[PDB]
Amino acid sequence: DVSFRLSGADPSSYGMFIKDLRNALPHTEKVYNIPLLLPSVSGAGRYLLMHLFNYDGNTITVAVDVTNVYIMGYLALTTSYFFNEPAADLASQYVFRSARRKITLPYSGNYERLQIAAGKPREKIPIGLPALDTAISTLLHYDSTAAAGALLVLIQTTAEAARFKYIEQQIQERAYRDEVPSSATISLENSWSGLSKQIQLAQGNNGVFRTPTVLVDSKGNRVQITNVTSNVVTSNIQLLLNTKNI
């Protein structure tokens, strides 16, 4: 398991949590020095538990699929909540079995469905450590509309930060003040699967992407990533989705 406490949290303790999260994801291989997530894992070993504590010390446990860093569901007190999708339904066979009741959320876990449920795109939702504290608090008491927004925050400040150093840093910059994600942040989130794939395809293609990946940079400018010498590959991305899952 990995843990993070918002009480007394700072950029350093958050960085340690994101390091712990990355290190809890198994791999047998690196591709261009980036851990390659496994094609599959069987049984309960597929799911990592993140223990998150809000400022007042209340807690939820979030279940993460270790092959793709997707949040499957979470436990709040004696109630479990899972996304309305087959991967989460399967996860419900292995985690939070001792919950007194299980609620299936009225949406799947993808950004499009969560944004619909929440009533807004995540371009408009502030993220940061304060937003994470709020998210945890919201998820403690069932409200499916409020939960969608909280889950958008949760996913970005945990999974997306684990996947990209740039995103981890953006959240560190928002340790004490929330701010909507940069366009670059959104672009990276949207491109994780594409980049993971193209980095793997570059292995037998002299480090060259078969298909370029278009991103937005820090300065708001749209850029083409064509090969593994780009900073996105050498510095930023920290985990690759196995091409067998793409």
Ligand SMILES: *[C@@H]1O[C@H](CO)[C@@H](O)[C@H](O)[C@H]1NC(C)=O
């Ligand atoms: C590869 O990407 C680098 C870094 O962005 C770029 O400067 C260069 O023109 C590209 N080289 C090749 C061989 O594609």
